[PDB]
């Protein structure tokens, strides 16, 4: 019903996905209590937030950072 708008138009769509490209990161380890992640370099990227890494042990990708972060 809807798919007629790209008959002979090649339907240009995204190729790589970051739906899960998190997982190829070597999730960082520290051996501490709280760590900063202004991830992506200073004065760029998301603001600095302090995460508690004490479960048994992960952080939660800061809410912003996306990258899997842990101890």
């Amino acid at each position: 019903y809807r798919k007629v708008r790209f008959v002979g138009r090649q339907k240009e769509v995204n190729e790589n996905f970051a739906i899960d490209l998190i997982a190829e990161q070597p999730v960082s380890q520290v051996g501490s209590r709280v760590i900063s992640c202004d991830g992506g370099g200073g004065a760029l990227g998301h603001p600095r937030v302090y995460i508690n890494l004490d479960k048994e042990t992960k952080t939660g990708t800061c809410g912003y950072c996306g990258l899997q972060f842990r101890q």
Partner: protein, 376 residues
């Protein structure tokens, strides 16, 4: 066409060869302006003042920011005032290039149009290096200038503005002692009486005919008292001696630029107290108190106290006034604009009677009518 590119339909019951009755029609570009600012905030509705003229870019937003600082009880900081003059007296070398060229293209001279716009493109370069963009720059804010101008622009304004007095020495030999253009413009459209003040005119088509007065040294704006210059007057009351203000003001604007490069104090740019200016990008990214005034200054606007106001600056063809009733919350109440074209063009019907039809196209160019500003 070839009369403002595609606007201004006017009727002329011409009396044989003379006109003796002329009554134009505006409203072909109305767009619904003043209805639509009621549904925006203060910072968000700023780029509809930039589009209210065409060619004045920093001269508008100079009379919006100054009409909101009054309501806030905030002055701009000292470096923020010597930036506004270096731009507010560089758009007076753009509104006067157009009024002395497109006037002389309707008459029929070809080259000084081309001879000046080839030179003019050295000066739309300067907007792009400072704000980011080509003509309509959202740069001035109600707390001073947005951001700092790059390393440069003082070895590049200085190379430019030391070599502009030769380019204005060409139009003197094209036009002034020319005979045919003097014959096309002497003693034409002589409205000089105190009906040329009962009509409520602003500047030139005033002071070029008699009355010496302008709002730059009878009222202040800024740190603008600290410059020295003289205000050119006209002798008789016709178009050729309100032409000669526009040639002479361009020489006097070079003096106010060369006096402005020497005086800029280093310092801040934004108003400091952060309920009006946003903070730095390297400041809203470490501390906590900076997001709450970066975030909430972008969901809702400021909070400005109630009470009306009015102001006026010297736009390079007249005034530019705002009657900005603010209720007391983030979205303003009525915002009535005063611009020329109401005075400057209601007084054409007096001005045109007795002369030919080919005198009428000679009249209109000297008022420097820019449409969308008849949207007042």
């Amino acid at each position: 066409h070839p009369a403002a590119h595609g606007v201004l339909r006017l009727v002329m019951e011409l009396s044989g060869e003379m006109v003796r009755k002329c009554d134009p029609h505006i409203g072909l570009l109305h767009r619904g302006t003043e209805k639509l600012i009621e549904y925006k905030t203060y910072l968000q509705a700023l780029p509809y003042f930039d589009r209210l003229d065409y060619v004045s870019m920093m001269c508008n937003e100079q009379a919006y920011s100054l009409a909101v600082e009054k309501l806030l009880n905030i002055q701009p900081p000292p470096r923020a005032q010597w930036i506004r003059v270096l731009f507010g007296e560089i758009t007076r070398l753009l509104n006067h290039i157009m009024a002395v060229t497109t006037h002389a293209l309707d008459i029929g001279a070809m080259t000084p149009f081309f001879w000046m716009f080839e030179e003019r493109e050295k000066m739309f370069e300067f907007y792009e290096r400072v704000s980011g963009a080509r003509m309509h720059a959202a740069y001035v804010r109600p707390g001073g200038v947005h951001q700092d101008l790059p390393l440069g622009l003082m070895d590049d304004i200085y190379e430019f503005s030391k070599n502009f007095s030769l380019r204005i020495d060409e139009l003197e030999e094209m036009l002034t002692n020319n005979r045919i253009w003097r014959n096309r413009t002497v003693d034409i459209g002589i409205v000089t009486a105190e009906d040329a003040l009962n009509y409520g005119f602003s500047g030139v088509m005033l002071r070029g005919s008699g009355i010496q007065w302008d709002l730059r040294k009878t009222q202040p704006y800024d740190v603008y008292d600290q410059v020295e210059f003289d205000v050119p007057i006209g002798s008789r009351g016709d178009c050729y001696d309100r032409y000669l203000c526009r040639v002479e003001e361009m020489r006097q604007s070079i003096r106010i630029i060369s006096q402005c490069l020497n005086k800029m104090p280093p310092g801040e740019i934004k108003v400091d107290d952060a309920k009006v200016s946003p903070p730095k990008r390297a400041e809203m990214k470490t501390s906590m108190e900076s997001l709450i005034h970066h975030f909430k200054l972008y969901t809702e606007g400021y909070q400005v106290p109630p009470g009306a106001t009015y102001t006026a600056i010297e736009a390079p063809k007249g005034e530019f006034g705002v009657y900005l009733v603010s209720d007391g919350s983030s979205r303003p109440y009525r915002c009535k604009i005063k611009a020329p074209g109401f005075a400057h063009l209601a007084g054409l019907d007096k001005m045109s009677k007795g002369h030919m039809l080919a005198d009428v196209v000679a009249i209109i160019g000297t008022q420097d009518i820019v449409f969308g500003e008849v949207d007042r």
